[PDB]
């Protein structure tokens, strides 16, 4: 049930390949309901 500062380091601990993509989101999908590796890693 990571929410906030934990979600920051959670993505750092997961992957370095695409380093987050860029050009309802992660907080809605992961914070309130404790997402898993499936979608959390997708934000790489």
């Amino acid at each position: 049930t990571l929410c906030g500062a934990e979600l920051v380091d959670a993505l750092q601990f997961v992957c370095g390949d695409r380093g987050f993509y860029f050009n309802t989101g992660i907080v809605d999908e992961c914070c309130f309901r404790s997402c898993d590796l499936r979608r959390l890693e997708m934000y790489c």
Binding site: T1, C3, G4, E6, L7, V8, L11, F20, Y21, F22, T24, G25, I26, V27, D28, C31, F32, R33, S34, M42, Y43
Partner: protein
């Protein structure tokens, strides 16, 4: 005796006099302002024919009250009906000059005389005999201090032609007019009158009788309605006054007419007492079947009277009439917007209430946080539903938290319904419990589910405890960790700690919207969250400044509310802990009876026990008496929301940022008594050192030592007796001898030798140690020629020993 006149009111003048023919009145008679007319007749008209008035008499600026000399004397009030519990009132007269009506006894009612615009002669009348009237004590000199009188057959005119009685410690003569006064009777002959010559009337009489020992000439009644040669000498079987009985049926009728009287006035009377009374002892009730008073199951069985059927309560003081009640006939409405306290005031009044019949509503209130101040309520009948066919109605109580501790209370309602509207601080679990306890859940089956409590925490979790350590003045505390889903919303912890002399406390028991602050509250900021939740530090805190021996009570988090989910950090079990024992404080101030060396006992258990007080210690470091004077050449006679919104805003910005920046693809010892005895010591203020400890062990904890110093009497006494052996020298020199059992402890009170010539004055000289030790004797001063007598005495008062002077003659030059 004679005609009977019904009591009727007096807008007329000719009705001012109503004593013409009817010697008794069947009702109530009183005079008022009436027609504004000169007292031409009333100032001199005499009509003492009437002797008795059944009910009270009232005066209201009656014009006729100007001068009274012999209007109508010999008036003993029956008091069947009373006004303000008065069978006679002297009030509202604006032009009264002389009070000379001249009164034997007023029955069942006091007399009011205070706040009279015009009154006099009050200091010359013994109102105690007519009635004690201690209930009100309004019989005071209104204007006798300014000498309103203008007409006294006592010491004022010389010869005392009137009877006298003690008034405020003064033997004030009974003065009413220039010569009139009160009738006198022997003390044995009371409450039934007597003739002019002092002859006592019959025991059936009421007031002075024209014919002695003739109840026919009287106007008294009989409690059994004999209606003739009635008898009223009450035997023990006859249960009103010394000469007036009630037996067993008069007092029965006293309550029979009032049996169905659900009003004031007519009241029920009990025959169980020797004198028929309408009241009963605090633990005694009128018997439903029997007619004698019956003890109750509990004290104060009083049922509170109803008015109009509704007795609403607000601002505490509206409930003052409900100090003690058992069952309430009518309906109750409760609405307490605010106040000072909840339990100390509202539970102090409505706590004792036991049962209700019909309706009770919590209309609109704020101060009520815990409803459990209704401490003893058991059953509300609910046979009379006021509105909506309801029985108990809770409404508009924004901060009402607890109805009753349902593990303890057993309140049940036979009939009616419930309703809870606008009750935001009371979770639905509590109302469900109340319905289960009330017996109307299911049986005799209106819940808002939104206006009821939903802004406060419910569906609570359990917070377990952990490591615990303490000292005598500092208890620590550490508990298990717990986080809601979105951990940052949890603002922190609220720890509530509070004293607990006994192991029975709850949360809201001593609280209200007034902020009683029974439970001290502290807040702890959350610990830093750590990965591997096992490695997280246990959320901890300690508080200081405690007491070293009390059984303390301790136990809830804070959560910023989210609309999506209602989750709150719960409370913890009320865990009772006691700080470890330590040293007690200074002992109670000691009391010593240092009577004798063999008779010394000490008397004290101070506050701050800091453990079971078990060990007492005693010491004494001193010396009995000085001994320097014993051996040296010394003379004994010669010796000298805003923050919540801030947190929510910070969380909102965080979630916006993360949402937009992420995209997918030695001594003595006693035990329990004060002290058995102290002895062994040898006539001095022996200094005794007393120490109070905690318990009897080498690990005892002892306070500062209190000190005791008190003087014993000397167990040793007379010390020198026998004849005064002496030798006479040729140069007028004599010698003295004695034996000295020198015991160096104590002081001889006198320690001197007295010598006196024959027929001359007596002189004494001190005794020195060297006289017995060094000089081996003593020598007197210059002795004049003649017979001389010598006295030897040394006592540590003495019973008196005849020291033989053995008179001797010295050389005469």
């Amino acid at each position: 005796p004679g005609e009977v006149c019904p009591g009727m009111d007096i807008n007329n003048l000719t009705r001012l006099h109503e004593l013409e023919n009817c010697s008794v009145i069947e009702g109530h008679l009183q005079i008022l302002l009436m027609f504004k007319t000169r007292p031409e007749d009333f100032r001199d008209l005499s009509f003492p024919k009437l002797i008795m008035i059944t009910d009270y008499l009232l005066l209201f600026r009656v014009y006729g009250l100007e001068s009274l000399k012999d209007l109508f004397p010999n008036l003993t009030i029956r008091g069947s009906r009373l006004f303000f519990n008065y069978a006679l009132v002297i009030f509202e007269m604006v032009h009264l000059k002389e009070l000379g009506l001249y009164l034997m006894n007023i029955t069942r009612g006091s007399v009011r005389i205070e706040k009279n615009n015009e009154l006099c002669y009050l200091a010359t009348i013994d109102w105690s005999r007519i009635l004690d009237s201690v209930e009100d004590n309004y019989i005071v000199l209104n204007k006798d201090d300014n000498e309103e009188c203008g007409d006294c057959p006592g010491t004022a005119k010389g010869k005392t032609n009137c009877p006298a009685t003690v008034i405020n410690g003064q033997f004030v003569e009974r003065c009413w007019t220039h010569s009139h006064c009160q009738k006198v009777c022997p003390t044995i002959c009371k409450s039934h009158g007597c003739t002019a010559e002092g002859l006592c009337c019959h025991s059936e009489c009421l007031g002075n009788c024209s014919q002695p020992d003739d109840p026919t000439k009287c106007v008294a009644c009989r409690n059994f309605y004999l209606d003739g040669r009635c008898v009223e000498t009450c035997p023990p079987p006859y249960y009103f006054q010394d000469w007036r009985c009630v037996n067993f049926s008069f007092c029965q009728d006293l309550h029979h007419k009032c049996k169905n009287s659900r009003r004031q006035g007519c009241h029920q009377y009990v025959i169980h007492n020797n004198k028929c009374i309408p009241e009963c002892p605090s633990g005694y009730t009128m018997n439903s079947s029997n007619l004698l008073c019956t003890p109750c199951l509990g004290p104060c069985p009083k049922v509170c009277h109803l008015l109009e059927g509704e007795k609403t309560i607000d601002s505490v003081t509206s409930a003052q009439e409900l100090r003690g009640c058992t069952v309430i006939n009518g309906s109750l409405i409760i609405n307490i917007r605010g106040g000072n306290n909840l339990a100390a005031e509202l539970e102090a009044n409505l706590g004792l209430i036991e049962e209700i019949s019909g309706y009770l509503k919590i209309r609109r209130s704020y101060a009520l946080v815990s409803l459990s101040f209704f401490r003893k309520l058991r059953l509300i009948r609910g046979e009379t539903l006021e509105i909506g066919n309801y029985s108990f109605y809770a409404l508009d109580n924004q901060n009402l938290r607890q109805l009753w501790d349902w593990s303890k209370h057993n309140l049940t309602i036979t009939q009616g319904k419930l309703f809870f509207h606008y009750n935001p601080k009371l979770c639905l679990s509590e109302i469900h419990k109340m319905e289960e306890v009330s017996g109307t859940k299911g049986r005799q089956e209106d819940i808002a589910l939104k206006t009821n409590g939903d802004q406060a925490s419910c569906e609570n979790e359990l917070l377990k405890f952990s490591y615990i350590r303490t000292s005598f003045d500092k208890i620590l505390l550490r508990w298990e960790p717990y986080w809601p889903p979105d951990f940052r919303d949890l603002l922190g912890f609220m720890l509530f700690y509070k004293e607990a002399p006994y192991q029975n406390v709850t949360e809201f028991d001593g609280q209200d919207a007034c902020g009683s602050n029974s439970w001290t509250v502290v807040d702890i900021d959350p610990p830093l969250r750590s990965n591997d939740p096992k490695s997280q530090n246990h959320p901890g805190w300690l508080m200081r400044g405690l007491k070293p021996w009390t059984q303390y009570a301790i136990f809830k988090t804070l959560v910023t509310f989210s609309d999506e989910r209602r989750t709150y950090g719960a409370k913890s079990d009320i865990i009772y802990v006691q700080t470890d024992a330590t040293n007690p404080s200074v002992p109670l101030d000691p009391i010593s009876v240092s009577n004798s060396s063999s008779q010394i006992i000490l008397k004290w258990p101070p506050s701050d026990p800091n453990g079971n007080i078990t060990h007492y210690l005693v010491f004494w470091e001193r010396q009995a008496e000085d001994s320097e004077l014993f051996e040296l050449d010394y003379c004994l006679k010669g010796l000298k929301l805003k923050e919540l919104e801030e947190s929510s805003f910070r969380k909102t910005f965080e979630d916006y940022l993360h949402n937009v920046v992420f995209v997918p693809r030695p001594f003595e010892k006693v035990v329990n008594k004060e002290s058995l005895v102290i002895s062994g010591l040898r006539f001095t203020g022996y200094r005794i050192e007393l120490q109070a400890c905690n318990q009897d062990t080498p690990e005892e904890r002892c306070s500062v030592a209190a000190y005791v110093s008190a003087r014993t009497m000397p167990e040793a006494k007379d010390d020198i007796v026998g004849p005064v052996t002496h030798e006479i020298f040729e140069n007028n020199v004599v010698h003295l001898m004695w034996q000295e059992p020198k015991e160096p402890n104590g002081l001889i009170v006198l320690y001197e030798v007295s010598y006196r010539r024959y027929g001359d004055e007596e002189l004494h000289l001190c005794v020195s140690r060297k006289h017995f030790a060094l000089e081996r004797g003593c020598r007197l001063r210059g002795l004049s020629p003649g017979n001389y007598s010598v006295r030897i005495r040394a006592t540590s008062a003495g019973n008196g020993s005849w020291t033989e002077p053995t008179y001797f003659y010295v050389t005469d030059y």
